[model samples]
Target: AVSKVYARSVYDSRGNPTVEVELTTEKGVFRSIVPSGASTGVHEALEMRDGDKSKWMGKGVLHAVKNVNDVIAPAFVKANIDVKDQKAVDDFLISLDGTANKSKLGANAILGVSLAASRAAAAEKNVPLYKHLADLSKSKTSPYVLPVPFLNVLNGGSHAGGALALQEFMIAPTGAKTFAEALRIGSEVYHNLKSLTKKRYGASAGNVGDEGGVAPNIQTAEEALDLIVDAIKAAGHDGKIKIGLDCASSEFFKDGKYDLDFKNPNSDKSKWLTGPQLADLYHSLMKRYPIVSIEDPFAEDDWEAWSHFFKTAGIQIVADALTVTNPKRIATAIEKKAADALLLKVNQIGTLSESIKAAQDSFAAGWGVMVSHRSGETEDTFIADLVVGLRTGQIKTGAPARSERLAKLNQLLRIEEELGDNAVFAGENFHHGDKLL
Candidate 1:
């Protein structure tokens, strides 16, 4: 029987406030910490902050914390729901809030409880969290698969304060035989990239961004990719590692055009790339680099641009801004075939059951599902177990540095050790992740 629940506000990696939750059972206390996004994102569920100007510049979570303690905790414990019943727990939380978008209790407040409940449920079942989640999803597949880590080794756009427009430049070590090996390869390449950045742009350029990626004052997408190429070769993993980009197109969107240098003061509208031009640029880069995936290549509502590129691009065209882990949006994308993949962020959906269902729904539509981390993340490793449990085949935490980012990677490493012989690495099958499922 689940006994008690409580919450308190905690600081996130970016110094913004989020929630830390504890769900207690006979076993002990199971804890979870909510993660925050890099910046305000498009079409995401509300992340309620206190908004009191004096309180941490209006970025406090005291209100959400109160909601958890006052309303959610007392009622949930009294509900007497079985801890193993993940769906029941989440359903109760959802209905209790009774808001269409979970804005009432705040996704932050609801998500923490939902995540903590699942952790408690796993303990009650006497199994690992991934195994419990796998059973909870009713996954038809047997023998858990470890997700291929798409390590974001460089940052730009809103993630890094730079003139560069693309947000994330990542490496997918798809050729690695095991998840641990992939981390090793990706970490080696990350260090090599750091060295190259320092050599080309001076020592200050080697300093890390929020995601632990070097934010050198690089100008164009080509320069970033070129540096990545050099890093791959330097690490001796040239053919093993493939490149991916997160355009975060909504950030640069301006009246049907995309400003490639939006961070610049008074960016010239004349120089902004049209949708077609941006499409062509991606195509050109794909041909030049071992590019396998591109996320948010167009603005969120730019459906035509998405479909046009999806029809033409040979690589994985991921939808982050377009879907935001919302069921309705995922359905819309599935019907339109606007992209080839879904970047599932649990906080975006506001509940663990919904997050699982998002992957299930996306996989049903034959789309790749990449479990992702927010830029303003915590040391919480829930998503690590989620990725392995669901066999999503791909995960995008940050670069191979920073404890918050590495904690997820380290958990995956431990999970790999636990799985032993039966564990399969989602290497070349990352794009075809459903195959692993």
Candidate 2:
């Protein structure tokens, strides 16, 4: 049981204020840091941000922090819910909020406590966090395996100064025998990409993006793919590494057309592509490259485009904007055959209990689950454990750079070393990782 809860504001990787929660239990105090997403979903549970113009460009978390201290914390202490009973704890928090979208207490406030409680339970059970989470998974994905790191080595969209429309360009070293090996291969490719970006786009083009990817001023999608492929070959992992993309297409979806040069100011609508045209472009790319997965290939509300593409797209079609980690939306995608995988973002759904169930539901839909990290991050490596616990075969936590991004990956390395003989790496079976065990 939790004896006390302390909520405060801390700086995310982007230097924005976010929530930090500390839970005091008999064994120890467990702390959790909440991450913020740059390209957050409209359907996501509300993330409370103070609009006070005086502080931090109105991105203050004081509002959510206050609610946790004055309302949720007191009630939680009095409730004395079993820390290990994750569902009951989250249900109580949900009921306490008394709002459909958790606007009352704020998703930020509720999630802080939710995550810390999960950690507290892990500590109480005297097991590693992932092991405890496995018990709570409600899935028989035993013989716990490590996830294939879909390292985001190139950035565009809102993440970079470049004119590229796609948000993220990643490399998945799915041929590695171990998570450690995959990380090394990915880092080598990342360095190679950096050097190539410097050589091809001039010295300054090697500047990194918000996600620690090279922000070269290149615009063409083919240019990005060629550069990434060049990097993979430079690193001697051409055939072994697969590629993925996060189009974040909703950012450019306007008036039933996609503005490929959305970063440009003038003459953008003059040459926009329709849904099918964009789909054809992606189809062509798939045939040319080792592109295995694409997230948010269509607009969030554009169900027709999603279904149209999924009907023929042989690669993994991930639902990020379409699902937003909400079970209802995931059901919609499954029913319409709009997407093949779930892009699991904890902040989108607001709680670990909800996030787990979302993955499980997606699994039931015969969909792969890819746990994700937001553009803004923290040093907290909790997601590393969550991905392992859920046995999601793939995770995209940005490139093997930046302290916040590497923190999760390093945690996974420790976990792999701990699991030694029992650990399995979800190599080529990334899309069907759960079937490994």
Candidate 3:
């Protein structure tokens, strides 16, 4: 049984205040730190903050810390620590909140405790965290697969201070035989990108964004894609790497239309695209670039446009904001066939149980799952083990540079070494019936 629980304030990679929870049992103590997102979707669960103007620019998490210590901690006291079912504990937390989006206890508080409890349970059982998570996922077979990484190399939108509209442009080391090899390939490409950006756009272009991707003053989306392709060739991994985009189109979407004004030089002739027009734009880009994935190509509420794009886009159409990490929303998207993949984030649902269910459902539907990180991240590597544990086959941890981003990728490399020959890269499994490569 859980004997004690504690909560405290911590700093994320962005130096913003966040919550950290610690769970103690007879066996040992386990800890989990919550991460924050910069370019968040409207439908995401509430991340409770104190809203105190005097502290941390209204991002104070003291309220969430108190809730974890006063309410969440007391409720979990004496709870069975070795319970095989994670849903029971997580469900109790949800019921205690009594709010649809976990606004009462705060998703940060709830997730901190939820993740801490799982880690504590893993220590108690004398098993690795991935092993425990695999069992919690109730996998029918061995659930161990190194995911193909989506390394964000170019930054735009809210993640960057630049004027570009798209959020992220990434490179996937598709030709790597192992996770270590993939990481190496990605690092080479990232370094090549840095030199190339500095040469083409000047020194300031190498400045990194919130997620560590180079934030250059690029104009159009095609320009960013072109730079990435050039970087791949410069790194001597031309065809060995493929491109992925997190359009985060909702940022540019407003008033029922997609705006490309940020990409336009002449304000008098701003470019705008309707839903179908935007789909056509993506079609043209795919034909020109080795783009394998496109995420959130439309606004969250634009179901019709999402459906249209999913049907026409020959590559992976990922539902990030559209799914909102809610199981019901995920089911709705599955029923509507809104996208071919899911962008999994734990805190988006505020609980590990719910996140697991979301991944399970996506896998059951034969859709790809790309376990991902937020823009404002932490050194916590829980998500790294998570993707491997769930065998999700894909992960997006930003560039291999910043410590926060490198933390996840490095952990995956360590896990690969630990697993040795047992470690298997997801590789082409993410193709999902498409000839993406």
Candidate 4:
């Protein structure tokens, strides 16, 4: 069947803040091509009447263009290709092979064509696009190994320092002997931190500070560490399950007061941690939790603090905001030894090939890579396949959006079956500390 592509703005309730393009070809193919969610996109309501969303939705629209030009257009021109024949189109698409040339296609063009290729392959194989892609590749796939399950202590920062304080014990499959043990470890640590946060802050201080509300007085660095240690001991995997911290770019003063903008003033930003605050928090977590990884502990641009942390913290630190999937920015961070791991986000860089290059560069330099998702997400498993294919099995999708997270997780499950059980799930013990707010 000829490929058909449709574009729609996937909104975040207020309106369509993101443009999602779906391509359907012969077989049962469907793919959310290219960058799906864009905050800078023109609101669809305004765009339809005024075409204002064009500039921001440039990447999304480009996907459709590439689909027509590279895949659909080229297939028709191939000597043995028959544009009118559905089977011919399907066969040609499936047999076609080539890594996307970032320089030639450009980021936007690569995104569009990749989406088209993925969707066409899925339709032809009658399987999910990500699964089909996974089937196409074999050994030397990226992410050669998955993270062993471990605990990440809530080092008091924006999320943990404020009313959202909690100790997150992450248990990788290798870290936990069995699934039951992993769940027990996660559940106990989560609830234990919950109770501790309530006692120190208040009953209102639940998980991650009121579902996006700004706040202070959530959890403290020392308190977060104490809870993590206790949970680790209770779970009976103290040494086996390594622990880390999720500080999430607190960026505050020594007094623990947020001097900048506040997402919700009625909530306390005072408890939010900053550079000095994070330094102190990290010291305390190191002494107690002995964390193996810390996410977004300081501001993205705080090279001084990052250098200090890398020199003093003496543990694996992952850069989420610091890297933000920008290759140039990531290179800067690497030069400074800002962290040991990088959180990969395709949409952040606007294309899969772009993200893949970032992963390749980082991998070449021996940095730990963790493919990730954004808060505004969808049921697209592309990220998952990349993670499994690359062996960067760490993923951080929360529970609120199960459908979106599951798309990635389910793909991992299938890959594990196909690749002989090497694919693993990185637990959701991390938090979105008050960095973006």
Clash-forming residue pairs, model 1 = none
Model 4, residue 426: C-alpha shift (Å): 9.5
| TM-score, model 2 to reference | 0.99
Each prediction's RMSD to truth: 1.0, 0.8, 2.4, 8.9
TM-score between candidate 1 and the true structure? 0.98
Measured by lDDT, the strongest candidate is 2
TM-score per candidate: 0.98, 0.99, 0.96, 0.64
After the best TM-score superposition of candidate 1, give how far the Cα of residue 260 lies from its true spot, in angstroms.
0.6
What is candidate 1's lDDT per residue for 278-346, written digit by digit as tens? 999999999999999999999999999999889989889999989999888999999988998999999
Overall lDDT per candidate, in order of appearance: 0.90, 0.92, 0.85, 0.49
lDDT of 2: 0.92
Tens digits of per-residue lDDT for model 4 on 1-437? 43454444444211224445555455544546343322211111011111345655432344434444555445533433322233334344323423222323333333433455555665666664444444443225332333233323232233233433332323332355433345445546555555665666577654442112112253344554565566556556566555555555434322434332242356456545466665775677567665667776666666778878788766667887677776787788889988777877665554444566677677666677766655445556676666555555455543221355445555555555555543333333222110101
Model 1 poorest ten-residue lDDT run: 135-144
| Regions more than 4 Å wrong, model 3 | 78-84, 140-143, 262-270, 431-437
Clash number for every model? 0, 0, 0, 24
Question: What's the lDDT for residue 162 in model 4?
Answer: 44
